[PDB]
Design a protein around this ligand. Structure first.
Ligand code: LD4
Length: 149
């Protein structure tokens, strides 16, 4: 898999995160991110994908050591952590063939796992519109605890 890069954008209170909603296969809510081009540095891909999907330029705010990285089915995803962006910021995708909506969500209300179906004696997981964000939620809460208490 080609690595992906993007951002976890938080507001000034540290309560809220910015998610984006795609279409079709990407029809739920997730962090803004995308696949690296040939020769492109990680920090540059993260600002490019985030600017295409949100209209906000993170390049002046990226810190090189502040990120959460996960490997999911043998594809690496790294999201740079960007705190203190005001909730009244105007966000506007470039690409509205790709992005349906852009919204702030309360971190403490987001799920950090999907629910099973053990009430129906059935295997697997119930559908959840946050499926693409979910793997990052617990590592983000632990990172914010360590760095801010
Ligand atoms: C995990 C997987 N995917 C995504 N975002 C994708 C990229 C386009 C933006 C709409 C959401 C879909 N985030 C985290």
């Amino acid at each position: 898999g080609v690595p992906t890069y993007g951002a976890i954008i938080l507001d000034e209170t540290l309560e809220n995160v910015l998610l984006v909603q795609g279409y079709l296969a990407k029809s739920g809510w997730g962090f803004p991110k995308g696949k690296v081009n040939k020769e492109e540095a990680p920090h540059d891909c993260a600002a490019r994908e985030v600017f295409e999907e949100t209209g906000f330029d993170i390049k002046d705010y990226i810190c090189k050591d502040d990120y959460i990285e996960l490997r999911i089915n043998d594809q690496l995803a790294r999201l740079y952590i960007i705190p203190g962006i005001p909730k009244d910021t105007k966000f506007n995708p470039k690409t509205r063939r790709e992005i349906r909506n852009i919204e702030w969500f309360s971190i403490e209300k987001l799920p950090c796992h999907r629910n099973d179906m053990t009430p129906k004696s059935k295997l697997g997981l119930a559908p959840n519109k946050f499926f693409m964000a979910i793997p990052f939620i617990r590592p983000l809460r632990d990172w914010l605890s360590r760095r801010f208490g």
